[PDB]
Coordinates of C-alpha atoms in Angstrom, one line a residue:
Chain A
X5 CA 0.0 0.0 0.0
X6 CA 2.7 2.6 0.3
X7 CA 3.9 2.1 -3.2
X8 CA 0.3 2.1 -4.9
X9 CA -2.8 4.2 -5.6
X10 CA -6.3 3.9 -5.0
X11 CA -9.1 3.9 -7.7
X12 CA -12.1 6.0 -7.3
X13 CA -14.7 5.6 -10.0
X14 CA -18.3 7.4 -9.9
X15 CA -21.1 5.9 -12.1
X16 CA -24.6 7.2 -13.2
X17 CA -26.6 5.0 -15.3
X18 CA -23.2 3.5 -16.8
X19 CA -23.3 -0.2 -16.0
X20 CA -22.2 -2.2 -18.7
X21 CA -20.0 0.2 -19.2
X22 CA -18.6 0.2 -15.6
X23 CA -18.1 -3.2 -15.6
X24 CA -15.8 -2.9 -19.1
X25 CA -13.5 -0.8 -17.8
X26 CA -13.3 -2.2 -14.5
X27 CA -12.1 -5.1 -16.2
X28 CA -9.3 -3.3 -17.8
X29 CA -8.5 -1.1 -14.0
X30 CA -8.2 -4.3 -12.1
X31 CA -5.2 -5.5 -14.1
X32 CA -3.2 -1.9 -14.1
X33 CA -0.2 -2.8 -11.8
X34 CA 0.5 -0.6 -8.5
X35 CA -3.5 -0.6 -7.7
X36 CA -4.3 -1.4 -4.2
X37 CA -8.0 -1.0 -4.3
X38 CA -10.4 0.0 -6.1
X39 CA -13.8 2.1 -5.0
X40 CA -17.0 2.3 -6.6
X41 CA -19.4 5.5 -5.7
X42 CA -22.7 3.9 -6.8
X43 CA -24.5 6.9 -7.7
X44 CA -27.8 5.5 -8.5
X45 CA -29.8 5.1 -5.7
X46 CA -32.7 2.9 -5.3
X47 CA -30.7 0.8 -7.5
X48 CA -29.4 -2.9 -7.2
X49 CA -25.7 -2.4 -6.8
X50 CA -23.7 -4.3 -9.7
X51 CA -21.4 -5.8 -6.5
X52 CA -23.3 -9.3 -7.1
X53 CA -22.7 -9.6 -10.4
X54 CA -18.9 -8.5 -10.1
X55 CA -18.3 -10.6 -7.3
X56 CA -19.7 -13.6 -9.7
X57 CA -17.3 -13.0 -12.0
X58 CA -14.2 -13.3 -9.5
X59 CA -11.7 -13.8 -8.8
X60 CA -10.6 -10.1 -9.2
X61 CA -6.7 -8.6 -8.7
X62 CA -8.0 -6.5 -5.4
X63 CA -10.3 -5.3 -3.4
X64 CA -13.6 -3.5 -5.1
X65 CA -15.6 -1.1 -2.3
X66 CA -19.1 -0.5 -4.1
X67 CA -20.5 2.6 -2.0
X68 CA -24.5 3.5 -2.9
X69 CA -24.8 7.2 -2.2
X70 CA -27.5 9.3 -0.4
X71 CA -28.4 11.6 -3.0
X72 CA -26.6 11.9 -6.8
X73 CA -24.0 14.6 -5.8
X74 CA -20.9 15.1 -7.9
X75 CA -18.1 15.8 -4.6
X76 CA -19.2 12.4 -3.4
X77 CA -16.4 11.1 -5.2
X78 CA -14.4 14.3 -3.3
X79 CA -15.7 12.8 0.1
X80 CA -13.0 11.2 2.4
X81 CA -13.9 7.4 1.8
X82 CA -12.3 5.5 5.2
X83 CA -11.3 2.2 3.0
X84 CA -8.6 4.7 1.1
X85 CA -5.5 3.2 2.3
X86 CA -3.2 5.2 0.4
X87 CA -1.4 8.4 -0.2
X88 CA -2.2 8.6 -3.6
X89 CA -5.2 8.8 -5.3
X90 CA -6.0 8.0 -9.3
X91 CA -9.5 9.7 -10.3
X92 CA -11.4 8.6 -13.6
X93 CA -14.6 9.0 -14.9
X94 CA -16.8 6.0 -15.9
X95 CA -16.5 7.0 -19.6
X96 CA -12.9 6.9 -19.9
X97 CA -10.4 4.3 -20.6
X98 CA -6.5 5.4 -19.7
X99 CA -4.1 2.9 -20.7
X100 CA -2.3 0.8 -18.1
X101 CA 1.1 2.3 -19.5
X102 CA 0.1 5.6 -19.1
X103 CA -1.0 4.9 -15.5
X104 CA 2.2 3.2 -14.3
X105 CA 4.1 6.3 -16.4
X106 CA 1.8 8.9 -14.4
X107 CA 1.9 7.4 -11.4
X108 CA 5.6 7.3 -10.9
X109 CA 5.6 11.3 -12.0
X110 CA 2.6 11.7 -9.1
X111 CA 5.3 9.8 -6.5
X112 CA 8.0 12.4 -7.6
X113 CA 5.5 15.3 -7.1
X114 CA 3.1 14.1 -4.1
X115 CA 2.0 17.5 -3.6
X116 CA 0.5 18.1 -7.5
X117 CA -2.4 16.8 -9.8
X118 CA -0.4 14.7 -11.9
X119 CA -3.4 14.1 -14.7
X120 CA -3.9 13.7 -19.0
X121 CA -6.5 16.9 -19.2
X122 CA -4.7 20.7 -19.1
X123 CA -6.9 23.5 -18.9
X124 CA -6.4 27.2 -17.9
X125 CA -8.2 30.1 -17.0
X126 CA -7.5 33.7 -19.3
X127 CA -8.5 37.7 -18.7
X128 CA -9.2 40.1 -21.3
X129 CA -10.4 42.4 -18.8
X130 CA -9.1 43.3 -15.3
X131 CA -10.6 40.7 -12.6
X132 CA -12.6 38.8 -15.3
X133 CA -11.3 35.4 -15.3
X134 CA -13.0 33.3 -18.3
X135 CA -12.1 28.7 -18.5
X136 CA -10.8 27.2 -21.4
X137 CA -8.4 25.2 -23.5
X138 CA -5.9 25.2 -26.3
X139 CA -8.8 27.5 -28.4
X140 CA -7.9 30.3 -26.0
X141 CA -4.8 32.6 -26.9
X142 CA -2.2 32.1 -24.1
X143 CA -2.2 34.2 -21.5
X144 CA 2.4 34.5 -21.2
X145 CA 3.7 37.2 -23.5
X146 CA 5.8 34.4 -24.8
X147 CA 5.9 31.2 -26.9
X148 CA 3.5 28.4 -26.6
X149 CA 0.7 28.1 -24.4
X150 CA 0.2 27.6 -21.0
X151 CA -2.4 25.8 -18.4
X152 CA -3.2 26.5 -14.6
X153 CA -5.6 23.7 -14.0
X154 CA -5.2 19.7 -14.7
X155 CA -8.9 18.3 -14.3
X156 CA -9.4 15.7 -11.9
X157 CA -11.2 13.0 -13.3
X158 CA -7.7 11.8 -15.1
X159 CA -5.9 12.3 -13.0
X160 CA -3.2 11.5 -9.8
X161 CA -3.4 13.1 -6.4
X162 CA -2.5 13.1 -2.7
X163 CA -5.3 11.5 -0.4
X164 CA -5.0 14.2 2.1
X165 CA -6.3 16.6 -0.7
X166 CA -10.0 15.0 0.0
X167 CA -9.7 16.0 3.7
X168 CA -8.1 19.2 3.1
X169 CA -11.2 19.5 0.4
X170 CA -14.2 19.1 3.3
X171 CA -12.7 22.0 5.6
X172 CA -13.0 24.5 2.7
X173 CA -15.6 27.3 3.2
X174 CA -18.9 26.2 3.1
X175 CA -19.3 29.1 0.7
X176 CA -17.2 26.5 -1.9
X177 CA -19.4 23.3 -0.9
X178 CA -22.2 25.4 -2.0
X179 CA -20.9 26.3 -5.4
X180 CA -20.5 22.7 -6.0
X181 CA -23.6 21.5 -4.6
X182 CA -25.4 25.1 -6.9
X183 CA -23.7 24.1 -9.8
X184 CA -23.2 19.8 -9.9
X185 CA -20.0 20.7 -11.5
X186 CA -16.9 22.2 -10.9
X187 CA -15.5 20.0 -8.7
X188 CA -12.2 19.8 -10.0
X189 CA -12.0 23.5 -10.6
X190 CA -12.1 24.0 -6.9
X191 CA -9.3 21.3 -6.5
X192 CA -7.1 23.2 -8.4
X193 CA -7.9 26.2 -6.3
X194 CA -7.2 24.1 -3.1
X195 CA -4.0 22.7 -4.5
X196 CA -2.1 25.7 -5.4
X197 CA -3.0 27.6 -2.6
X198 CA -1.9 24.8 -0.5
X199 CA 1.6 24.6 -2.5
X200 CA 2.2 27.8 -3.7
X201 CA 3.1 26.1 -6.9
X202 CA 1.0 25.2 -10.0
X203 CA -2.1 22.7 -8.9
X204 CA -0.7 20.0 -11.3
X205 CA 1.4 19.1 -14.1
X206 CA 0.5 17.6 -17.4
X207 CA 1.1 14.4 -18.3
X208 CA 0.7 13.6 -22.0
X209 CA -1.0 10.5 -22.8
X210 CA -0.4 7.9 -25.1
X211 CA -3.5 5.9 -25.3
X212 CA -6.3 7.7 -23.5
X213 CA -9.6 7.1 -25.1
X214 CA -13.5 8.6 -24.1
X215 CA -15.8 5.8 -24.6
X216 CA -17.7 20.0 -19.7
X217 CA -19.8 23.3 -18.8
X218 CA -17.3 25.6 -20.1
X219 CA -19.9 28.7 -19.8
X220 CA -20.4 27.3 -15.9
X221 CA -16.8 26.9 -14.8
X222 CA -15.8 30.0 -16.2
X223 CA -18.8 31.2 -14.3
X224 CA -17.5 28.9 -10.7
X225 CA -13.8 30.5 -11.9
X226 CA -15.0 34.2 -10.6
X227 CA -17.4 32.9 -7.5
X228 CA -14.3 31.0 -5.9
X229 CA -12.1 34.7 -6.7
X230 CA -14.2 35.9 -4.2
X231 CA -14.4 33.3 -1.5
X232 CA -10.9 33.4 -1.7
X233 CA -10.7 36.5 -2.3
X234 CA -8.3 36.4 -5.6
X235 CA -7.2 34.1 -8.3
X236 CA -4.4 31.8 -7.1
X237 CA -3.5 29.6 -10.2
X238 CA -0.2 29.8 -11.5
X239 CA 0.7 29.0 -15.0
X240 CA 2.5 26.2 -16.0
X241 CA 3.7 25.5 -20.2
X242 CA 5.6 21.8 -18.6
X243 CA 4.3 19.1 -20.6
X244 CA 5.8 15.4 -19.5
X245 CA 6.4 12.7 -22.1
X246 CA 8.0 9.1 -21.1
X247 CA 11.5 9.3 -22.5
X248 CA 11.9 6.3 -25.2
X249 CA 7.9 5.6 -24.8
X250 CA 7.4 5.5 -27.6
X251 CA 10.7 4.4 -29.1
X252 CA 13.3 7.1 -30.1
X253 CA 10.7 10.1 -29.2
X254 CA 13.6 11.6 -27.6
X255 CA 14.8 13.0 -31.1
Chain B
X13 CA 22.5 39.1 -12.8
X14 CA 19.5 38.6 -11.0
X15 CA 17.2 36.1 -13.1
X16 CA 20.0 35.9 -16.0
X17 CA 22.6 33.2 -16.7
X18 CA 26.1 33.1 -18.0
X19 CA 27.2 31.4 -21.0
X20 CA 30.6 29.5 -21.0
X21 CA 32.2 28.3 -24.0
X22 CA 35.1 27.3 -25.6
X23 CA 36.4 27.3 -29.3
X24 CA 38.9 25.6 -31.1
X25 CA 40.5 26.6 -34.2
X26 CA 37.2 28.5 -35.6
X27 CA 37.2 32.2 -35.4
X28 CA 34.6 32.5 -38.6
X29 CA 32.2 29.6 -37.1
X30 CA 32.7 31.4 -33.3
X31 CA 31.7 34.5 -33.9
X32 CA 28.9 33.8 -35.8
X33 CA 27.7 31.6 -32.9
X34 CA 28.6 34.6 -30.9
X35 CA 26.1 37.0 -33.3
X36 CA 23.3 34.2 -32.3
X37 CA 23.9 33.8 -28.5
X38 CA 24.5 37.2 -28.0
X39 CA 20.4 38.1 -28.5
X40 CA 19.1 35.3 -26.4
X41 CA 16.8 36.6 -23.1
X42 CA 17.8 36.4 -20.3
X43 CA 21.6 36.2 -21.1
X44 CA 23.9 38.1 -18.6
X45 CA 27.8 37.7 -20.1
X46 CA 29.7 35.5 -21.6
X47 CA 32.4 34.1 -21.6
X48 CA 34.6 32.6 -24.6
X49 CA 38.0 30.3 -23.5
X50 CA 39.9 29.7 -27.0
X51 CA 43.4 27.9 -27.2
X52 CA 46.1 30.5 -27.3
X53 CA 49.0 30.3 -30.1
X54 CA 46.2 36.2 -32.0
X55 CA 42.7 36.2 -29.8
X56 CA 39.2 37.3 -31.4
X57 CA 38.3 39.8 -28.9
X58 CA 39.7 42.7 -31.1
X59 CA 37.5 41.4 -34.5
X60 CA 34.5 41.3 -32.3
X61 CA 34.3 44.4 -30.8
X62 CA 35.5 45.9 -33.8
X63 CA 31.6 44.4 -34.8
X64 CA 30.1 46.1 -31.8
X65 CA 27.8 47.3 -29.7
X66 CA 26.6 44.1 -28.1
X67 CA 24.2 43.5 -25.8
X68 CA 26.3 42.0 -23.2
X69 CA 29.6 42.1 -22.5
X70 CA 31.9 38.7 -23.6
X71 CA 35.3 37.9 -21.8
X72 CA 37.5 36.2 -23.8
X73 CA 39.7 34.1 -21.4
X74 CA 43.4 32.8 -23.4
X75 CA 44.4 29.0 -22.4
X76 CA 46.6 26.6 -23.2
X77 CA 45.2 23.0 -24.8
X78 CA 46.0 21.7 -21.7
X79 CA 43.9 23.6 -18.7
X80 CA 40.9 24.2 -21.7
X81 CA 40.8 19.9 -21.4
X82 CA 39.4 20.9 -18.3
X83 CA 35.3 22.9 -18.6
X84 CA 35.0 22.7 -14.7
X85 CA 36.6 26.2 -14.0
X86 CA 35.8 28.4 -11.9
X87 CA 35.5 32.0 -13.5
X88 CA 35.6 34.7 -11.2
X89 CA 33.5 37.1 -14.0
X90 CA 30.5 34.8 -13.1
X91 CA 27.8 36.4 -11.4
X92 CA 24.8 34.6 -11.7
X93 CA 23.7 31.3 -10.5
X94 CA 23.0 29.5 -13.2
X95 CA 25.7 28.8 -16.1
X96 CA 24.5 27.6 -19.9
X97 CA 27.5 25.7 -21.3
X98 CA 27.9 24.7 -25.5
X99 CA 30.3 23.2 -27.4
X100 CA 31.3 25.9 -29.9
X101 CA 29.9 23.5 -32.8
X102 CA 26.4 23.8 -31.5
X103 CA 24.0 26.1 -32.5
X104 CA 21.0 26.1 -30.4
X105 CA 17.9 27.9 -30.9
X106 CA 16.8 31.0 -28.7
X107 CA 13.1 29.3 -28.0
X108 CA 15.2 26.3 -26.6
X109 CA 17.3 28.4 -24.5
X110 CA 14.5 30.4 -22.9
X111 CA 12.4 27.4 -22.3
X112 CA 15.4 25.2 -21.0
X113 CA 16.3 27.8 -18.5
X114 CA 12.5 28.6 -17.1
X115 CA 12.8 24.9 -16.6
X116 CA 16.6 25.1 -15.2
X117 CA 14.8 28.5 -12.6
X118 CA 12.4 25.8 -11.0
X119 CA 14.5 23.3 -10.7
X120 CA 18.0 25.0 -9.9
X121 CA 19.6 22.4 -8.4
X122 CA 19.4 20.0 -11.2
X123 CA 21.0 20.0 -14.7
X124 CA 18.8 21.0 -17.3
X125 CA 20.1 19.9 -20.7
X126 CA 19.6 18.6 -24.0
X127 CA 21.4 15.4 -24.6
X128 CA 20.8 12.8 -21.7
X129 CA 23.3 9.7 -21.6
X130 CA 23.2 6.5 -19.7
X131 CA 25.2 3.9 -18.0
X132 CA 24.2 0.2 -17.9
X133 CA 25.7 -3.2 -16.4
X134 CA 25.6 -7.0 -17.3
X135 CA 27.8 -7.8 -14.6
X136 CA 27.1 -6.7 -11.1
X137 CA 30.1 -3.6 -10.4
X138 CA 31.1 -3.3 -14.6
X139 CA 29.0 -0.5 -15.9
X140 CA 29.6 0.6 -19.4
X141 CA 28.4 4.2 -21.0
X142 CA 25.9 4.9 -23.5
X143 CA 22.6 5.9 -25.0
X144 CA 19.2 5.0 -26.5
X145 CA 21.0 2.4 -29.0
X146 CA 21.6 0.3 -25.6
X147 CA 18.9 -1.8 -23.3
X148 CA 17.0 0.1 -20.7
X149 CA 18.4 -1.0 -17.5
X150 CA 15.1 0.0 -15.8
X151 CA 12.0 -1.5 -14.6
X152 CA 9.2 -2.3 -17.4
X153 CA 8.9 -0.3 -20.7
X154 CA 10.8 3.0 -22.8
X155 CA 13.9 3.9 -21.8
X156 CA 15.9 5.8 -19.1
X157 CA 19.0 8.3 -18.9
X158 CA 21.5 8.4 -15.7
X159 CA 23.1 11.5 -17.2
X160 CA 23.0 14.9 -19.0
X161 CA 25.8 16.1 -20.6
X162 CA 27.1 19.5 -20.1
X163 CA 27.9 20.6 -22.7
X164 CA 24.0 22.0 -24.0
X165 CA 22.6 22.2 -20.5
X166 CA 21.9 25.2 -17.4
X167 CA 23.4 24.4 -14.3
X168 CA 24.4 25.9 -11.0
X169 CA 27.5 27.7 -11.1
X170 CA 28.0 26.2 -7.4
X171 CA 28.4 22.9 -8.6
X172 CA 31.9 24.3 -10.1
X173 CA 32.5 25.6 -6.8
X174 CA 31.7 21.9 -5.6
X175 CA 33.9 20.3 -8.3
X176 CA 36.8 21.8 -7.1
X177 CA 36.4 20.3 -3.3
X178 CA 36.4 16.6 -4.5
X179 CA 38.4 13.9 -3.6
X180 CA 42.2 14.5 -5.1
X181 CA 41.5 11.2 -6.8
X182 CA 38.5 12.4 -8.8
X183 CA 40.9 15.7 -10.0
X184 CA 43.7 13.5 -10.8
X185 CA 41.3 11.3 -12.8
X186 CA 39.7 14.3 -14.4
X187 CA 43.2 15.5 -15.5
X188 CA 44.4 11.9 -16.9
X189 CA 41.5 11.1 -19.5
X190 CA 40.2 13.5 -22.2
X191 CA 36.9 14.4 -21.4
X192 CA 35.1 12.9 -18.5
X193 CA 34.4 15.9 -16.4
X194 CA 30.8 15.4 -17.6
X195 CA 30.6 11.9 -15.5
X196 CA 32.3 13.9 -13.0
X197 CA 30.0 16.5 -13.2
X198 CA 26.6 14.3 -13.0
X199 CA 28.2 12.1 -10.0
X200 CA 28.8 15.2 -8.2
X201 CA 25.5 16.6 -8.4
X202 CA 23.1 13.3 -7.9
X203 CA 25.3 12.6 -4.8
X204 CA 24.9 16.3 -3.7
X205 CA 21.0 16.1 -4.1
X206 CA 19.7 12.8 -4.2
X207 CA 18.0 12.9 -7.1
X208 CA 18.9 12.2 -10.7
X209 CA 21.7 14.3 -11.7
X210 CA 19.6 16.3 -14.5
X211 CA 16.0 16.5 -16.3
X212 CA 16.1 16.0 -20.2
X213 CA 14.1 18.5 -21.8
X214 CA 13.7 17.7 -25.5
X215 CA 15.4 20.1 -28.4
X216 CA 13.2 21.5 -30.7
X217 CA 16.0 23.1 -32.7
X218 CA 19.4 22.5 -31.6
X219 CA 22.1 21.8 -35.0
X220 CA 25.5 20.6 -34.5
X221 CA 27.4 22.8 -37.4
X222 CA 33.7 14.0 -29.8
X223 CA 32.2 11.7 -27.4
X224 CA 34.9 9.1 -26.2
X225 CA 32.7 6.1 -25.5
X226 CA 35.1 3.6 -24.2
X227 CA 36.9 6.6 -22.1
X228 CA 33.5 7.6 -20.6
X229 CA 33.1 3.7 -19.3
X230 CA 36.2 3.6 -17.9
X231 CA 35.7 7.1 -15.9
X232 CA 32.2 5.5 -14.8
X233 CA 34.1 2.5 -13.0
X234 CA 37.0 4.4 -11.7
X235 CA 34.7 7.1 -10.3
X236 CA 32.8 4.1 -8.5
X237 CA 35.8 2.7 -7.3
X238 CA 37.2 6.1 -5.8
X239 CA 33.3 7.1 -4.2
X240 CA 32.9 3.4 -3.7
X241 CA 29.2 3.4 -4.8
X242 CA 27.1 3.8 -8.1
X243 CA 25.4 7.3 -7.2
X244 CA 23.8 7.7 -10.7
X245 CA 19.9 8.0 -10.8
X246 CA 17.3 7.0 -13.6
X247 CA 14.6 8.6 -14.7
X248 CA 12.6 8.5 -18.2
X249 CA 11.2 12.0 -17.3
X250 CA 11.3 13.9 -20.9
X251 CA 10.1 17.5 -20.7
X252 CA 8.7 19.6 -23.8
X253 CA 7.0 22.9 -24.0
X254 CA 3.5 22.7 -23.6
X255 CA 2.1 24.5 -26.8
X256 CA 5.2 24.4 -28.8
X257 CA 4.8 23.6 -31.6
X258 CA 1.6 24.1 -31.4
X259 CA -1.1 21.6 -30.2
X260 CA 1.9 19.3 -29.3
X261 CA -0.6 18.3 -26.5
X262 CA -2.8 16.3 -28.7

């Protein structure tokens, strides 16, 4: 457990699909357990019918939630045994490769969201922060382009972050709770402020595949200014590739 | 000198090819000084100020084939912490240069370079020197690096400061075969931070307008005979610009 990661998967009227990529998660090496927020409540849990398929590689914790919240997967889930966390949605298939890459970058940078998805926040006007991608000019006077968030839900990161998460002002757990989005957007917040370095650092990926409310999180970008009264993400134009994975990508 | 770095290099036989190396380097960002050691025999200080104004000034430093075998000096004239050292047969890009040393600022401690190197063994205690055309020694897939040369890299002028406070044995070694400071150089630093000597960040335009092999293994071995221990790091961490080229990310 002190040299592996925890899967945490949330699922909404995604079975068969669950189940598929579960299949694939089970087998990526370094994974000490795996958890399940079952999000669809009054609903048979799938736990019978993955158990009948065993045996599985470790552990699988199906939780059934209360309501159909999006932090539930942010909550601080007791059977998390260690320090690092990997975060996917139930619609997207990372390579095992990738993972093992990733999650040896996460154990040289503990404190950072090691993830596959850069995003970053720009200003065209004094204290107007607007979210977006690579279709956004960059915000450094310089070459390239930059991002100052790495979204969660492909991601790498610290445990503790989830506990650090539920003492934030209530003012953020309403935000999420008003807006059943933007999650991750507050993570980032959280990280940086906590480090006083850029929330995460993008890792590209080699063989990611998908089996956003841009005009929201831009919107959550400008409420969390205020509760924290200013805009702490830092910029970041690092982008981390596995040196000879592929073969001769060095040159 | 505050956020700037110093560029050392040294020429050999080349006065045409230097100074227009010299015209190139001379309008990268961030560049503090220079500083040019060429093998004495009439110097080509006088032709390039006669080509002036420049926008920093450029010490040209006179030495014998002999010291000039040695690149771990230490120049009083440097004032900055970090140092950007190339072979006077390289010509790489400004984009590289500014990028390499906003990596080099965040991780100062580290050498930040363009052409990483490994070492590898088949027999516990024998290591041998090389690069990508040899197996990865490490765990499951790509490959892995141990080392990054100095020659095209940023690193911290203390580490030259550090050089000269090893072992007698390490300077005496140094001294007797060609090159090898470089192994030198990335020993000293992973056993000074614990962490892989230096971070590869890939060239996007870097041209090359000689690597003793065999000499390099045997400096490997001696130097893990006279620290008696293998100090050399791996890592397959390979760092590009996010953005450059453009979508790069995708």
């Amino acid at each position: 457990a002190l040299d592996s990661f925890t899967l945490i998967m949330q699922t909404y009227n995604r079975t068969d699909l669950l189940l598929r990529l579960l299949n694939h998660y089970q087998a990526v090496p370094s994974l000490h357990k795996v958890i399940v927020v079952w999000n669809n409540v009054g609903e048979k849990g799938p736990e019978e019918l993955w158990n009948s398929l065993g045996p599985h590689p470790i552990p699988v914790i199906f939780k059934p939630q209360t309501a159909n919240k999006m932090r539930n997967r942010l909550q601080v889930f007791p059977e998390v045994e260690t320090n690092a966390v990997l975060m996917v949605d139930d619609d997207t298939l990372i390579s095992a490769q990738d993972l093992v890459f990733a999650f040896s970058i996460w154990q040289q940078f503990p404190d950072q969201i090691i993830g596959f998805v850069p995003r970053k926040h720009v200003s065209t006007s004094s204290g107007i922060y607007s979210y977006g991608g690579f279709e956004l000019q960059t915000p450094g006077p310089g070459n390239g382009d930059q991002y100052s968030m790495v979204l969660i839900g492909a991601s790498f990161f610290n445990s503790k972050y989830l506990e650090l998460f539920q003492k934030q002002p209530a003012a953020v757990h309403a935000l999420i709770d008003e807006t059943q989005n933007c999650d991750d957007i507050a993570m980032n917040f959280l990280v940086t402020r906590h480090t006083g370095k850029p929330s995460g650092i993008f890792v590209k990926p080699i063989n990611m595949v998908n089996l956003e409310h841009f005009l929201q999180r831009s919107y959550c970008i400008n409420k969390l200014v205020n509760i924290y009264d200013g805009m702490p993400l830092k910029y970041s134009n690092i982008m981390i590739s596995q040196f000879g994975f592929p073969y001769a990508n060095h040159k």
